[PDB]
Design a protein around this ligand. Structure first.
Ligand code: SF4
Ligand code: SF4
Length: 55
């Protein structure tokens, strides 16, 4: 699983780019469903602040 850390500015650009639709808008920051994420790294590639990190 990847996890979106506190650098997230909630721009929303990663949500459409997740191939398995694991990302959604949350309170404060976007969130990854760890039971769906397959570690492709696509969300970090479109993140301007590089908030998604592999855990
Ligand atoms: S690493 Fe890939 S599967 Fe996981 S949330 Fe990011 S884009 Fe989706
Ligand atoms: S692209 Fe990055 S800054 Fe924008 S919502 Fe996703 S994790 Fe947050």
């Amino acid at each position: 699983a990847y996890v979106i850390n506190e650098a997230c500015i909630s721009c929303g650009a990663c949500e459409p780019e997740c191939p398995v639709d694991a990302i959604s808008q949350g309170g404060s920051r976007y969130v990854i469903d760890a039971d769906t994420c397959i570690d492709c790294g696509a969300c970090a590639g479109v993140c301007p602040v590089d908030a998604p990190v592999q855990a």
